[PDB]
Design an enzyme around this catalytic site. Structure first.
Site, short mmCIF file in Angstrom:
data_model
loop_
_atom_site.label_atom_id
_atom_site.label_comp_id
_atom_site.label_asym_id
_atom_site.label_seq_id
_atom_site.Cartn_x
_atom_site.Cartn_y
_atom_site.Cartn_z
N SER A 287 40.47 -34.81 -5.57
CA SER A 287 39.91 -35.55 -6.69
C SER A 287 39.78 -37.01 -6.28
O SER A 287 40.79 -37.66 -5.98
CB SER A 287 40.78 -35.42 -7.94
OG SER A 287 40.32 -36.24 -8.99
N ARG A 288 38.55 -37.53 -6.26
CA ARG A 288 38.34 -38.93 -5.90
C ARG A 288 38.75 -39.89 -7.01
O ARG A 288 38.87 -41.09 -6.75
CB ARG A 288 36.87 -39.16 -5.53
CG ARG A 288 36.43 -38.39 -4.29
CD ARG A 288 34.92 -38.43 -4.11
NE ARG A 288 34.49 -37.82 -2.86
CZ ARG A 288 34.49 -36.51 -2.62
NH1 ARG A 288 34.85 -35.64 -3.55
NH2 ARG A 288 34.09 -36.08 -1.43
N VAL A 289 38.95 -39.40 -8.23
CA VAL A 289 39.51 -40.25 -9.28
C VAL A 289 41.02 -40.39 -9.11
O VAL A 289 41.57 -41.49 -9.20
CB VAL A 289 39.13 -39.70 -10.67
CG1 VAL A 289 39.84 -40.48 -11.76
CG2 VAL A 289 37.62 -39.76 -10.85
#
Lengths: 134, 115, 172, 86, 115, 115
Positions: free
Chosen positions: D33-35
Site C-alpha cells: 500500500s503506497r498510502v
C-alpha cells in the site's frame, strides 16, 4: 630444570617447565626430580603437586591414568583429570555423600567392585580439595 | 465448506490439500539433493503424501476392459475414514504400491499382503 | 514447453539456489564446531606420539607384539568415510590412493583387509569387491570414544594372533 | 499491467499459500500500500511494524527450516516467531 | 572517465567502488565464518568501508524537518578530497559515527572532537 | 542402414550416438552438482564421450590457412577402427588433448606421447 606435559582425552591440563613434582602411583606416591631414573607406571585415584618456578604449587586432580618418565621431559596421561578450582569442597562433599550411600547400598562383590571405585573417586577428591587450600 | 459438508469432511479435505502441497515442494529438493538431505519430519510427510497420492486412485466399473480388473464403489463415510487413516499413523507401514488402484482402505492392507 | 513451463523451471532453480546456500552456512558452522573438537583432541594424541618415542628407542626394551616388527604377508587398513553425500571429491580421492597402495601390496601377493567407518566406504569397496572384516556407520555429528571400537577390536585381535602383519589408518 | 500502473496498492492473493492453508492467501512483501501508515489508526500503526519485520525475517529463515535443528538460538527464535505470526 | 573528470576524480571513484565491492565480499565471510577468519588487512578495509559508507550520507535543506539538522552543500573538490583522505588512511583514527550525516571532512574532524 | 553399410559401421555409429546422447542427459546434473557426484560408470561415460567429441575434429586443407596445420584425409576403415577402439576403452589412458585435430588414431597416440 625439566618440562612436564599433562593431558587427557578431553583437554590438555598442563604443559611447561617445572621445578619438582609429587605424583600418585600404583603402590604409593612418588616424588620426581630433575633427570630422575626413567620409569612408567599406572596411577591410583589421587592428584599431582605442580611446584613451578619461584616455588608456586598448583593442585591437579588425577582420578585415573598413567605417568611416563623415560626422557627428561615427563608426561602424565589421565583417563579422568580435573583442574583444582573447577572442582570444589562442595563437590567432594557431594562425592562423600554419594559414596557413603553406595557403601550402604552395595551388597555383593561386583557391585562392591564398582562402589569401591566410586569411593576411591570420592576420597581422592576429598584429598585434593584439602591440598588445594595451600 | 463446513456449512454444507460438515467440519469432519471439511477438515479431512483441507488436511489432504495441505499435505499434497507440502509434498510438491519437497519433491523438488529430493530431485537434486536427495531424500537423505531432508528433515525426518519432512521425510515422513513425503512418505505419507506419496501414499495419499496413490490412495486417491480407484478402479472403475466402466474401465474393466482397460484394467482387466473389476471396478469398485466407495461410500463417502468410508472415504473420509480412509483419508483420516493415512493422515495419521495407522498405515505408515504399508508400501506405496499397496494403495495403487485398490478400492477401500480396508483392502489396501490386503494388496500389501499380496504385494 | 512454453513460457509458462520455462517460468516454472526458473522458479525451481531459484529454490535450489536458496537451499544450496543455506546448507553452505550450516556446514560452515559445523566445520568450526568440529574444529574445536579436533583442536582439543590434538594435544592428547601428540603427547601419545611422544610417549611411543620411548618405545621407539631406549636401552632396555621388553617383548611386545604391537612393537615387534613382523614378517609381512597380510596387511589391514582402517578407512574412515562419510555418512553423507555432497562432500564432493573427498571420498574417492582418498579411496583411489588406498587402492593404489592396496594394489601395490597385492602386486607381490601380500594379502590385504579393510575395515570401514562410514557408509560410503562400505558401498564403494563392496562395489570394487574387496574384503571387509568389520564395520561401523551412523557416527553423525561426533561419535563417542567407545562406540567405534568394533573395527579396532577385530584389527587388534588380528595383529595379536598373527592374522595381521601390518595395520594402517586411512583418512583425509 | 494497466491496472497495476493506475492503482495505489496491490493485494496479491496466491494459490500456493491458499493450498498450503493460509486462507486469506495474502502474499506479503509483494503486496503493498503506497498510502501506508497514513491510512492507519494510531494503535494499529504502532503495533503493525513488528508484524512487517517479523514476516520479513521469517521469509529468509524459512529456507533454513528444513535443518533448523542446528542454528543459533537467536535465529531459531526468529524462525519460531515467524511461524507463529504466520 | 579520465578525459572528462580528470585522473584524481577517476581514481577516487574507482577506489571507492573497489573498496565497497571488497566489503560486500567480506560481509559474506563475516557471516559464514566470522570475524576471527578476517585478517588484519581485511579488518582494515572493513573499518574503512564502514567510514566511506557513512561519509556518503548528507543532510538536505529540504529534509530538515526530519533530521532536525541544517542542510549542507558540498563542493566537488571537497568531496573528492574527503574520500581521497579516508582512502589514504588519514582520518583513519576517527570514530565511524564521526562521518555520518556530517557534511565535508573538515566538519567530521569537528564532530569527532565532541562525539 | 545395416544392409548398405554393413554391421560394423552401423554398430559403431549407433554406439557413438548412444554415448553422446547419454552425455547430454548427464550435463544438466553436472552443471549444478559438478561431476564428483556422478557414479563411477557415469564418469566413464563422460570420459569417453569427451574423447569422442574431440576425435570428430579434423584438419582440412582449405583450413590450412586458418589453422596453420597440414590437412588430413582419413579412410573410412580408420574411422570405424578408431571410434570402436575409443568406445571399447582401448585408449582410456590417453588425455583428451591427444584426440583434438588428429587425422587418425595413430596420430592421436603420437600426439599423446608429447601431450
Amino acid at each position: 630444570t625439566y618440562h612436564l606435559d599433562v593431558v587427557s582425552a578431553e583437554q590438555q591440563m598442563f604443559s611447561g617447565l617445572v621445578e619438582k613434582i609429587q605424583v600418585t602411583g600404583s603402590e604409593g606416591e612418588l616424588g620426581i626430580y630433575p633427570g630422575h631414573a626413567p620409569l612408567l607406571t599406572a596411577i591410583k585415584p589421587g592428584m599431582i603437586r605442580i611446584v613451578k618456578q619461584h616455588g608456586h604449587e598448583e593442585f591437579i586432580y588425577l582420578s585415573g591414568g598413567i605417568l611416563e618418565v623415560q626422557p627428561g621431559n615427563v608426561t602424565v596421561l589421565a583417563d579422568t583429570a580435573i583442574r583444582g578450582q573447577d572442582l570444589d569442597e562442595a563437590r567432594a562433599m557431594e562425592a562423600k555423600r554419594k559414596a557413603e550411600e553406595h557403601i550402604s547400598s552395595s551388597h555383593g562383590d561386583v557391585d562392591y567392585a564398582q562402589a569401591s571405585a566410586e569411593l576411591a573417586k570420592a576420597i581422592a577428591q576429598l584429598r585434593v580439595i584439602e591440598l588445594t587450600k595451600k | 465448506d463446513p456449512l454444507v459438508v460438515g467440519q469432519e469432511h471439511y477438515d479431512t479435505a483441507r488436511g489432504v490439500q495441505s499435505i499434497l502441497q507440502r509434498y510438491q515442494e519437497l519433491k523438488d529438493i529430493i530431485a537434486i539433493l536427495g531424500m537423505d538431505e531432508l528433515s525426518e519430519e519432512d521425510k515422513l510427510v513425503v512418505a505419507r503424501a506419496r501414499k495419499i497420492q496413490r490412495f486417491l486412485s480407484q478402479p472403475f466399473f466402466v474401465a474393466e476392459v482397460f484394467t482387466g480388473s473389476p471396478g469398485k464403489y466407495v461410500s463417502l463415510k468410508d472415504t473420509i475414514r480412509g483419508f483420516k487413516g493415512i493422515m495419521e499413523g495407522e498405515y505408515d507401514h504399508l508400501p506405496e504400491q499397496a494403495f495403487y488402484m485398490v478400492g477401500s482402505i480396508e483392502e489396501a492392507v490386503e494388496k500389501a499382503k499380496k504385494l | 514447453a512454453g513460457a509458462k513451463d520455462i517460468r516454472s523451471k526458473i522458479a525451481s532453480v531459484q529454490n535450489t539456489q536458496k537451499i544450496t546456500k543455506a546448507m553452505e552456512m550450516v556446514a560452515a558452522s559445523k566445520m568450526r564446531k568440529s574444529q574445536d573438537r579436533m583442536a582439543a583432541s590434538r594435544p592428547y594424541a601428540e603427547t601419545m606420539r611422544k610417549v611411543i618415542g620411548h618405545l621407539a628407542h631406549g636401552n632396555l626394551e621388553y617383548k611386545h607384539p604391537y612393537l615387534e616388527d613382523r614378517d609381512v604377508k597380510r596387511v589391514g587398513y582402517l578407512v574412515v568415510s562419510t555418512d553423507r553425500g555432497l562432500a564432493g571429491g573427498l571420498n574417492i580421492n582418498l579411496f583411489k590412493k588406498l587402492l593404489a597402495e592396496m594394489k601395490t601390496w597385492t602386486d607381490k601377493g601380500v594379502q590385504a583387509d579393510l575395515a570401514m567407518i562410514g557408509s560410503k566406504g562400505v558401498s564403494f569397496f563392496n562395489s570394487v569387491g574387496g574384503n571387509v572384516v568389520a564395520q561401523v556407520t551412523g557416527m553423525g555429528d561426533n561419535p563417542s570414544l567407545s562406540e567405534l571400537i568394533g573395527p579396532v577390536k577385530v584389527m587388534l585381535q588380528a595383529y595379536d594372533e598373527g592374522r595381521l602383519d601390518k595395520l594402517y589408518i586411512v583418512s583425509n | 499491467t494497466n491496472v497495476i500502473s493506475i492503482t495505489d496498492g496491490q493485494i496479491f492473493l496466491e494459490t500456493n499459500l491458499f493450498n498450503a492453508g493460509i486462507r486469506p492467501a495474502v502474499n506479503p512483501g509483494i503486496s503493498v500500500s503506497r498510502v501506508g501508515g497514513a491510512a492507519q489508526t494510531k494503535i494499529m500503526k504502532k503495533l503493525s511494524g513488528g508484524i512487517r519485520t517479523a514476516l520479513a525475517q521469517y521469509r529468509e529463515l524459512a529456507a533454513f527450516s528444513q535443518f533448523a535443528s542446528d542454528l543459533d538460538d537467536a535465529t531459531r527464535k526468529q524462525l519460531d516467531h515467524g511461524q507463529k505470526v504466520t
